[PDB]
Amino acid sequence: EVAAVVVVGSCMTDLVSLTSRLPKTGETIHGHKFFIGFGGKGANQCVQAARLGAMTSMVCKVGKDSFGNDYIENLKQNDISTEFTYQTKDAATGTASIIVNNEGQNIIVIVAGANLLLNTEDLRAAANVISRAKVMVCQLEITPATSLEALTMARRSGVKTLFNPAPAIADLDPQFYTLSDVFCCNESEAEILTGLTVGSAADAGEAALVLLKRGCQVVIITLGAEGCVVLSQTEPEPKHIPTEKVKAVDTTGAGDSFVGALAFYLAYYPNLSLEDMLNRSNFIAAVSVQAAGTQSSYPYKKDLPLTLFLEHHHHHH
Amino acid sequence: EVAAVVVVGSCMTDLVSLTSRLPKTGETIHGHKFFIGFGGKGANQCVQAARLGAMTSMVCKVGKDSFGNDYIENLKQNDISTEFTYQTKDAATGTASIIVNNEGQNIIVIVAGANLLLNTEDLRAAANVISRAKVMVCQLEITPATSLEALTMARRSGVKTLFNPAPAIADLDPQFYTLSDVFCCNESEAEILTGLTVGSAADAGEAALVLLKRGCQVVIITLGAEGCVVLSQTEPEPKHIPTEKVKAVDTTGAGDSFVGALAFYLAYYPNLSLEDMLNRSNFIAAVSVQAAGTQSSYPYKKDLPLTLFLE
Numbered sequence A: 001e002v003a004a005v006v007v008v009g010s011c012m013t014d015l016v017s018l019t020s021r022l023p024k025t026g027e028t029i030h031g032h033k034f035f036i037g038f039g040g041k042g043a044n045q046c047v048q049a050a051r052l053g054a055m056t057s058m059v060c061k062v063g064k065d066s067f068g069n070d071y072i073e074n075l076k077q078n079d080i081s082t083e084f085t086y087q088t089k090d091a092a093t094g095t096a097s098i099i100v101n102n103e104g105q106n107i108i109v110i111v112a113g114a115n116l117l118l119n120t121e122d123l124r125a126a127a128n129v130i131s132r133a134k135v136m137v138c139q140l141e142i143t144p145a146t147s148l149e150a151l152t153m154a155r156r157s158g159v160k161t162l163f164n165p166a167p168a169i170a171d172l173d174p175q176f177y178t179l180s181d182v183f184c185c186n187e188s189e190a191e192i193l194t195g196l197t198v199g200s201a202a203d204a205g206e207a208a209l210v211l212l213k214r215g216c217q218v219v220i221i222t223l224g225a226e227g228c229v230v231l232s233q234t235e236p237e238p239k240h241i242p243t244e245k246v247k248a249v250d251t252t253g254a255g256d257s258f259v260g261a262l263a264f265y266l267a268y269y270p271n272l273s274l275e276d277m278l279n280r281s282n283f284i285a286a287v288s289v290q291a292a293g294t295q296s297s298y299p300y301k302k303d304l305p306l307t308l309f310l311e312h313h314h315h316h317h
Numbered sequence B: 001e002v003a004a005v006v007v008v009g010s011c012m013t014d015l016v017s018l019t020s021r022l023p024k025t026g027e028t029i030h031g032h033k034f035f036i037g038f039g040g041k042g043a044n045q046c047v048q049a050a051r052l053g054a055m056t057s058m059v060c061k062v063g064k065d066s067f068g069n070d071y072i073e074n075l076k077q078n079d080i081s082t083e084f085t086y087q088t089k090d091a092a093t094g095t096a097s098i099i100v101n102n103e104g105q106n107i108i109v110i111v112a113g114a115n116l117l118l119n120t121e122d123l124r125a126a127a128n129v130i131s132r133a134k135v136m137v138c139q140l141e142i143t144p145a146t147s148l149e150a151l152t153m154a155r156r157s158g159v160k161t162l163f164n165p166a167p168a169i170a171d172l173d174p175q176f177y178t179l180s181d182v183f184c185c186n187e188s189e190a191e192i193l194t195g196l197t198v199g200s201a202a203d204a205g206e207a208a209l210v211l212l213k214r215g216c217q218v219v220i221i222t223l224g225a226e227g228c229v230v231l232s233q234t235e236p237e238p239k240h241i242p243t244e245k246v247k248a249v250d251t252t253g254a255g256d257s258f259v260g261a262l263a264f265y266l267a268y269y270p271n272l273s274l275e276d277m278l279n280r281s282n283f284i285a286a287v288s289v290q291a292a293g294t295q296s297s298y299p300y301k302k303d304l305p306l307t308l309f310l311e
């Protein structure tokens, strides 16, 4: 009955137009393809955890609109609990409108909409699910104050906090660091948070140490094809966890796959070393980059080697 | 029960994001509102004409998708004939992604989908209705060859041709000029068609004269808050027709309101001067800019001054 992974965050309808060029102010242009996808960092993370076998619950707000109805059905199709998936008449379901040219350069207009109306009253009603989970996951796509209250509730319940400061803003409220058991971001988010350049594993180590000293317990910087770099209060010397060369088709939502995998390991394989968890998380996110379509690319257990689900240490998947 | 205004053209689902600025290449920006609307230049024009009291027929193609089913219901709710509104499983209902900033400037990305499957066989079935109409209206959101055939059919029956070259193509087929009784576009479309700058009513006059010489009978360039400029083969001196002074909330589809009003007046008030018709058409379009969306903002006859319907 009880969800082990609770995600408090964002659901967004992806509205994607492919064109030969991006438009200038005042321009009407013809694209050659349009498609609707299920996105939002919160839902993407929740979906990857659910597909690995996690019992998950998605605490979010969508609209009382067709896109919101379709989102609830998407979460139920991935066996995600929608008990505290709220629907509001007061705004539309969140949108990410994405225009992509032939070369892969894009413009993105996000309207967070109903996501921003998820409030502290909504979290109090969800308090039974949040307090009884193993892991609480949050990002920066809903109201900051709401993510902070979710982190506060999880901390006082002894629930592990996994925070993804995405998208990043430079002067983040210091409590996001001190309430984070695991603080996981990418290279460009690390640059925004620290003002430092991340062009190597060594540079990622230096950025992670800045983040650790602001009060995080564990800091992970994802490095795309370079894997990730990790350190912690107990082991402050950074480690580089590389990942084998694969043929990337579409990396969109790779970080969300990585975070959802990590939530799954924290919740169901708590005795694995952190480096083992991240090595597994790298392999699962690298499966996602080998196919198109964000949530569509996130593998299920049946599609993955069984060594990813061993109760003891295992290195090569 | 004869349709006086036949529109051969586009239906789109409008997916609209309101933002404080437009994004540059590589940029993610956060807007403050998202909404769905029934759009497409053809359907917008047809809806404005219908709401003024025109008997209209919409010749178009949508998808056998939820958006297309919703579109057909939208046309029936505006009392538009859907006799020649077709549905295809081989392409989705057209989409227009619209980003609008707080100064009212926009970018639009159209994926025309089922619009581009409306073909000359689909037009042939409408031959009787086109031959009995007063006005045929076309734009550039379907296959150009299909609009050219609709204008050709209209010209054969002596039906008035109203052509809106929107969105504009720099290399427009010369027959769009010679088949147009009334050729109506906005400032930026006039720039694309002529390669001239249009930064004033005087500049619009010069662009309109280039368009007149390519063989249009009448050229109208819409000028947003400045109203429109018109000239003709009989009176090639440009005339500036100002519009009503109003507070603009959402100008999206203002030109479609203007063109639908123009279609209504050509069909039902044929003896009005061009200046009178554009006076009226400006007033109606100026009502549309005072509210959100395209069709949702288009006024009905009952809500407009009586004098717009007198002669």
Ligand SMILES: Nc1ncnc2c1ncn2[C@@H]1O[C@H](COP(=O)(O)OP(=O)(O)CP(=O)(O)O)[C@@H](O)[C@H]1O
Residues within 6 Å of the ligand: A186, A187, A222, A223, A224, A225, A227, A228, A243, A244, A245, A246, A248, A251, A252, A253, A254, A255, A256, A258, A281, A282, A283, A285, A286, A289
């Ligand atoms: N080209 C590639 N080959 C193998 N694995 C990759 C990869 N790109 C990404 N990954 C995997 O996904 C994780 C996250 O990737 P990345 O650092 O690019 O995050 P991201 O998707 O958040 C950046 P963005 O926000 O721009 O999409 C990596 O740590 C790695 O495990």
Ligand SMILES: Nc1ncnc2c1ncn2[C@@H]1O[C@H](COP(=O)(O)OP(=O)(O)CP(=O)(O)O)[C@@H](O)[C@H]1O
Residues within 6 Å of the ligand: B185, B186, B187, B188, B222, B223, B224, B225, B226, B227, B228, B243, B244, B245, B246, B248, B251, B252, B253, B254, B255, B256, B258, B281, B282, B283, B285, B286, B289
């Ligand atoms: N700010 C405003 N105030 C009053 N009337 C306006 C207006 N903007 C537009 N209109 C009316 O709408 C008509 C059409 O205007 P315009 O040519 O800007 O529309 P449009 O929708 O075609 C331009 P675009 O494709 O760049 O959005 C004008 O002739 C005028 O009557």
Ligand SMILES: OC[C@H]1O[C@H](O)[C@H](O)[C@@H]1O
Residues within 6 Å of the ligand: B012, B013, B014, B038, B039, B040, B041, B044, B096, B108, B110, B141, B252, B253, B254, B255, B256, B294
């Ligand atoms: O003129 C406005 C229309 O043009 C685009 O086609 C949109 O669908 C919108 O409704």
Ligand code: NA
Residues within 6 Å of the ligand: A166, A186, A254, A255, A256
């Ligand atoms: Na990410």
Ligand code: NA
Residues within 6 Å of the ligand: A249, A250, A251, A252, A288, A289, A290, A291, A292, A293, A294, A297
């Ligand atoms: Na992918």
Ligand code: NA
Residues within 6 Å of the ligand: B166, B186, B255, B256
């Ligand atoms: Na127009």
Ligand code: NA
Residues within 6 Å of the ligand: B250, B251, B252, B254, B288, B289, B290, B291, B292, B293, B294, B297
């Ligand atoms: Na309007």
